[PDB]
Every structure is written in C-alpha cells, then in structure tokens.
C-alpha cells in the first residue's frame, strides 16, 4: 500500500538525451535512430527572439554549425530541417540505445514522465500532468529546453511532449514531438500567457478511490448524486465536467471498492461545499487532480514495465 | 522555476534489478559485480515467518535452491551466504551494467529515490525521506520486497535502502545494503509497530526558502526570533529541534533569498500557530517536510548527474 507521484523509470529515455549547440545557445536534443530533435529556437540569437522569420533563419545555417555532444563524443550532423517549431538534426550515427517507441499526443488530464536535462545530462525525473489549459506545471531552469515527456507500456517509450519556454506564472509550454504546441503559444517573445485553468474532476475522483483503497474512509457518506446535480456543483467550483466516459472508465475502481461512482461523486460534492475540516487524505489538505484512474489501478494493483 | 518532487534518473539502478525465487517465494535483488543482494527472508515458509531461525533455514539450502532471472535470461548461482538481514548470492557472471557504486546508511530526515520493482522488472521511480521514527512512507505491493533506494553524486549511485515488510500502518521498514535494519524492526512475524514519528524542521524550511525562490512570499513578516524560542515552539508541534548546525547549512539558501535563517524560523511560527487561511505555499495546503537544503539548491540551482 501507499500512494506516491510516480514517475516511469528513466533509464530508456537517459540513453536518448544529447546536447545541441548552436552559435552561443545550449539544449537538448532527443536522439532516436540518426536524428535529434530539438527546440527550433536554437538557432536564434537575442534579438531573433523579438519577432522572428524561422526559414530564413535556417536557411542561413549549415550542417557546420550544429554541434551535437552524446556524452563525451561528438556527433556529426549530415542534415538539417524543420518540422513545425522542432528541428531535425540528420546525424553519422543511429543511437545504439534506441527504444522501441512512438510519438504520441496526450489530451489535457492526462498524466506523463518528465525527465529534466541541462546539457544532455539527465538531471531528475518527476510525473507532470497536461493541465486543461495546455500548460504543464513543470520544474525547468536555464538551459532545460528539450528535455521531454513520456510514458511507458511494456518496453515501448510514447513521447508526447517536449519543454520550450516558461510562461509568466512559472508554468511551462511545448510540443508534441511533431513540434505542434500544446495550446495557444508560439516560440517568439510575445505576452503570452497561460490563461484560465480548471481542475480534473475524474482524476480527483480517481484519487478519492485511491485514497478509500488505502484506508482513507472520513469523507464517504450515504448520500448519492445524479450526473447532473453533480456537474452543476462541479461547474460552481471551477472543475470540468464528468462524462458518462468518465463514469464508465471509473468502473473498475468503483467495483474494487464497492463504492457507485456516483456515491464517490456525493462525496467530492460534500468535500467541495464544505472543505476537509483539519483532515487530509493520502497525506494531501487538498484535493489532487494529477492522476488518471490508469495511474490508480497501475499503483494500487501493481503493473511493471519491461 | 517550479518545484517537484524529483527523482534521481533511475537508469543506473535498472541495470542492476534481478528477480530472485526461492521455493515459492520470488521477490527482487540488485545484481552489483558478481553478488546479488535480497532480503533474506526470501528463505522462509509462511510458518517460518512465525519465529525463524535464519542461521539453520540458510544451511539446509542449496545453491540450487535459488533461482535468479535477470530478464529473460538465468544467472547461475555459485555461492550463499548470509550477512544480516540480507542474503549474498554469488553469481557466475558479474554485471555489465555494474554502475560506481557504494553502500551508504542514511540519517532520518534524509531523502533518497525508490525503484519499486516486481519480478525484477522495474515499475516507478520517487522520492522519499527517511522518517526520524526510521520508516518511510512509500508505495509498495505484494512482491516487491528488495526494491533499494538510492542517491546520485555525479556518475556514483549511493544505495542507502532495500525493502522488506510493510507495517500495518501502511509504512515501510527496510535494510541498509549491509542487511542492518533502519529502526527497530526485525523480519519475522511480530506485532512490531512504527512508534511516534516528528516533523523534520530544517527541511520544511529549506522548502519555504524554496517557495521564497519562487515566488511564494505571503508567510513572510518583519518579525524575527531566537533560537531558543523558536525550538520552544518546535517541540510545541512536535517538530523536532532545530540545530546551530541547521541554521549553519541553511546559509546559502537565506544568502540567496536575503532572508535571516531566524527571520525564517518567525514565519515557521506563525504558520504554526495560525495555519494557511486557506492559502498554499508551492501547490500545498500542508507544511512539506521531504525535501532538504541540498534537494532545494539543487532544483532551484540546476546540478546534473553523468
Ligand atoms: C530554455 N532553455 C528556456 N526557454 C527559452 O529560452 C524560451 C525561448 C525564448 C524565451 N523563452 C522562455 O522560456 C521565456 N520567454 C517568454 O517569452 C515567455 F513568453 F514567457 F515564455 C523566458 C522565461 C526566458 C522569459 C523562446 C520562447 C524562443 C527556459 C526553459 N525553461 C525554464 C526557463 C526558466 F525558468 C528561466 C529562463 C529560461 C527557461
Ligand atoms: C515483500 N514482497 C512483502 N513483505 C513481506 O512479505 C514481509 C515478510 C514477512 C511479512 N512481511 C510484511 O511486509 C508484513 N508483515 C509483518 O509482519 C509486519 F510486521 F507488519 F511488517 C505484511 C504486510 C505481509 C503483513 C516478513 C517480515 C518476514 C511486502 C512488501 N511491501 C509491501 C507489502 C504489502 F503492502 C502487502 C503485502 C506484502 C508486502
């Protein structure tokens, strides 16, 4: 028993992370068979930023001024190109520590593994989830850009996000591995901001039933809920609406504990109106809403990955 | 900017997690060089659980009577003994992926990374500390007994932890790799129990300074306090005591801040004896007490591992 925010082992992902340099700018790059793909922004310099015209800029470039560091070995670049706001650095060498892997992109709520780099060198590994306003509230200093999100099933890697710039309130913003933003940002200096957020309702549910799992029982009750009823109370206090989806993906949690859905429902209901009176659950005086119901039955029943 | 509980990369301790049976026991082990390490109640029955005597189960056993998988492939075992509370089993073939190592036992208040493992195949990475009554407070199913804990210093792994029993608290009481409990916990059946832990105090206050980095800045005051005074307060909220040397290794963080490690200790206080008013301070309604001065200044700072 026990309920941590666990992160997919890293080991597959450190063996893809190389630094990038280009001019006077440092990041990283994922290095899967003989391409790396970093953030385009490399090739900008500070006045670049200001309102930049990205082929223009590439096309000034040569493979020459790419410099590309696995480790203590240099990687020479044979090619370059740019897909969306992703640059593809064609290298001499296929990654011999290549995974089996995908690109994927998430949906806002769901959850991934963030595994922070300064200079190609893993640093720290920490579960994110994609909030609903396309921000990640990460942890990324100077130097970060690149470093990517992931999860795991069985032996394959699914890629779904890579760092690019912080945002104003200290959240984080970047792409899927095609280079497509998540949300309404763009990789230019501009006042952008991450704009109103909400809270994920099902995951919360599904933590409630992590937490009943765990033998955290104070804020179950007798009363119930329909759908609606609840979704106009989830609605007053900013969450998002839970869907017949959502029910039915709760299902097995639901028959594990012997708790309805819609009794779990009248519970956040109570705990919304009337807060948690001095008490915590799963060690938290707040409700948290970064964990899927995947993440809760993979925790609470024991999934490994190989 | 931000902060997350952050794991070290797990890479290097993957390389070593083996799956060690015996009889019709099967749990994990960490395959370092030529020796393969597990909790060495792996030997025992479930009414050898009741009262074992370690010493007569292990000389009735056999090489043979240990099966080790690292992945699909067997490990043959040439050699048993028993150092402790954990078992040595000597392997015909050292590890390849045998990272710098050493064992290190940690203090409580100290944090270290968990590999949570099944059958040898790893399943997560967190973080953790360990609690001054000597357990932890981790995520842990049926199988997972000789999972370790780690730190990282550049490219060495310092192992400080192996998993062996669950509490009926739900917490978790371990080995140091030399096989010598953390507390006053012992592998047999008895109705052993935690006992009354604290709250690391110079750790949550790392963790204000942390917030102060970032920007959380609401629980500061112009007020100040002694020492004495303060620890007077501490022991009040069942805090533990607040050293000169605390104060000492706080430096760098009140230096970056310019905030008095005493002017700290005020704000402490009054977040003591008042709470929150429904405030956070880095995404919790609680005061965290995982995370030490080093984990702050390296997240707020930027330090790697190769
Ligand atoms: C990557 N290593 C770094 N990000 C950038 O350099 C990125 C890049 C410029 C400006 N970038 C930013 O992240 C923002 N700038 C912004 O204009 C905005 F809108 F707020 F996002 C700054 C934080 C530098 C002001 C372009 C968008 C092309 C990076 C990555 N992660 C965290 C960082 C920090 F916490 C601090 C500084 C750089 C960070
Ligand atoms: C390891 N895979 C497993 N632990 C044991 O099997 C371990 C081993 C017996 C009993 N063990 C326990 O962890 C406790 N038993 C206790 O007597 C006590 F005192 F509470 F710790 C039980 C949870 C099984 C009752 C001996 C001490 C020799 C293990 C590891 N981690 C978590 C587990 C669970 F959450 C549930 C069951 C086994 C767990």
Not at 40 to 44: K, L, P, S, T
């Given at each position: 028993s026990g309920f941590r925010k666990m992160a997919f082992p890293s080991g597959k992902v450190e063996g893809c992370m190389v630094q990038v340099t280009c001019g006077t700018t440092t990041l990283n790059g994922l290095w899967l068979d003989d391409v790396v793909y970093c953030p385009?922004?490399?090739?900008?310099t500070s006045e670049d930023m200001?309102?930049?015209?990205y082929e223009d800029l590439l096309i000034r470039k040569?493979?020459?001024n790419f410099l590309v560091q696995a480790g203590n070995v240099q990687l020479r670049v044979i090619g370059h190109s740019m897909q969306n706001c992703v640059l593809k650095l064609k290298v001499?060498?296929?990654?011999?520590?290549?995974?089996?892997y995908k690109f994927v992109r998430i949906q806002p709520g769901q959850t991934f593994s963030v595994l922070a780099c300064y200079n190609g060198s893993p640093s720290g590994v920490y579960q994110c989830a994609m909030r609903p306003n396309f921000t990640i509230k990460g942890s990324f200093l100077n130097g970060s850009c690149g470093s990517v999100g992931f999860n795991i099933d069985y032996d394959c890697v699914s890629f779904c996000y890579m760092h690019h710039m912080e945002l104003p309130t200290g959240v984080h913003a970047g792409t899927d591995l095609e280079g497509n933003f998540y949300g309404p940002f763009v990789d230019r200096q501009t006042a952008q901001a991450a704009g109103t957020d909400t809270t994920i309702t099902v995951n919360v549910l599904a933590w409630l039933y992590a937490a009943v799992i765990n033998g955290d029982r104070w804020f179950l009750n007798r009363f119930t809920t329909t759908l609606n009823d609840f979704n106009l109370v989830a609605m007053k206090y900013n969450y998002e609406p839970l869907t017949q989806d959502h029910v039915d993906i709760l299902g097995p949690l639901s028959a594990q504990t012997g708790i309805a859905v819609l009794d779990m429902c009248a519970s956040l209901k109570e705990l919304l109106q009337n807060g948690m009176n001095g008490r915590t659950i799963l060690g938290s005086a707040l409700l948290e809403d970064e964990f899927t119901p995947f993440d809760v039955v993979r925790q609470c029943s024991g999934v490994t990955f190989q």
């Open positions: 385009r922004h490399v090739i900008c200001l309102n930049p015209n040569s493979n020459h001499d060498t296929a990654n011999p520590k290549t995974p089996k």
